[PDB]
Design a binder for these strands. Structure first.
Ligand SMILES: [Mn+2]
Ligand SMILES: [Mn+2]
Ligand SMILES: [Mn+2]
Length: 327
DNA sequence: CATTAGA
DNA sequence: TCTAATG
């Protein structure tokens, strides 16, 4: 957590690079398991040799650790950090729509900067187009204050279109966070669950709503179950407009909400841990259900849920307010 | 780890 | 169809 820090971070830098600037899936995969194990080991690695004892630790990375231990740095690391191309790739990457594949291609074409991308708006797609559009506000955090404002309007039309809806705005917001990166809207409807062969419109009706009122402003992607967009809060009585916000709305079978709710609400750890416990408790939890375990090794059969509580009662735990689902 | 775009 | 990019 800290006695093995420099090593871990260095490695992951090492790993993140192979994946991105290069295509080295494997090396990258390499640096990761290593960067993983070395993180677990309870003592101060004092030499590669020592590291090397480890699993996934080869001559390659161990060599790497000596150098880092020996001298406060690493050239390979220093070289990359300098490398304009590779820099370039990391950069373009921030552009929502942009991935490594693109990055690279873009770079090869010579598009390396913000401006580059502009000049060639043609070379980019709608997503990427949008991404480029709202790059600044896309990297901006969302104050709860706003979060509050957003969730309000949203439940608002949700309600309006059909009173039979259920929306929850999950994530850290849901968890109390003083700020969020985007807004995550979970959605369901009685008239939609497991078997009841859809009602795409169900999703459809809302986005449309939000749009008509100006909440929704662009479309990153619209599917019959997962919309992905951009939104904004009505820029008040002037002098202050709002940044373009990333938002996601998703449809869900009323029969699997709460799990998914539970889940997407986190925290990553809270979940893992709760889930771990459900294992002892003779259960199985996952993004959609909760199945009781059969000693044969495994089992099935989706226990019925109607609330965040049921899942809890099931594994006989303490209801944790989402406030404190921190871990 | 599944959904969406796209080419 | 595949492949990329999001989460
Ligand atoms: Mn070994
Ligand atoms: Mn990006
Ligand atoms: Mn998200």
């Amino acid at each position: 957590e800290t006695l093995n820090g420099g090593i871990t971070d260095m490695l992951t830098e090492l790993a993140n690079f192979e994946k991105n600037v290069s295509q080295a899936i494997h090396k990258y995969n390499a640096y990761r398991k290593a960067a993983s194990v070395i993180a677990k080991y309870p003592h101060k690695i004092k030499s590669g040799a020592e590291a090397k004892k480890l699993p996934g630790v080869g001559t390659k990375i161990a060599e790497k650790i000596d150098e880092f231990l020996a001298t406060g740095k690493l050239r390979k690391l220093e070289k990359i950090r300098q490398d304009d191309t590779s820099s370039s790739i990391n950069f373009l990457t921030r552009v929502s729509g942009i991935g490594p594949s693109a990055a690279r291609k873009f770079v090869d074409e010579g598009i390396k900067t913000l401006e580059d991308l502009r000049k060639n708006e043609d070379k980019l797609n709608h997503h990427q187009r949008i991404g480029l559009k709202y790059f600044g506000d896309f990297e901006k955090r969302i104050p709860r204050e706003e979060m509050l404002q957003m969730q309000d309007i949203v439940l608002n039309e949700v309600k309006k279109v059909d009173s039979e809806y259920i929306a929850t705005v999950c994530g850290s917001f849901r968890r109390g966070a003083e700020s969020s990166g985007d807004m995550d809207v979970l959605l369901t409807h009685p008239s939609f669950t497991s078997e009841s062969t859809k009602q795409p419109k169900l999703l459809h009706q809302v986005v449309e709503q939000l749009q008509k009122v100006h909440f929704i402003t662009d479309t990153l992607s619209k599917g019959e179950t997962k919309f992905m967009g951009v939104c904004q809060l009505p820029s008040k009585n002037d002098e202050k407009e709002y940044p373009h916000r990333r938002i996601d709305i998703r449809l869900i079978p009323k029969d699997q909400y709460y799990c998914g709710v539970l889940y997407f609400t986190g925290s990553d750890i809270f979940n893992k841990n709760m889930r771990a416990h459900a294992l002892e408790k003779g259960f199985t939890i996952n993004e959609y259900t909760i199945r009781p375990l059969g000693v044969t090794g495994v089992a099935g059969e989706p226990l019925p849920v109607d609330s965040e509580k049921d899942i809890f009662d099931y594994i006989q735990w303490k209801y944790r307010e989402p406030k404190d689902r921190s871990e």
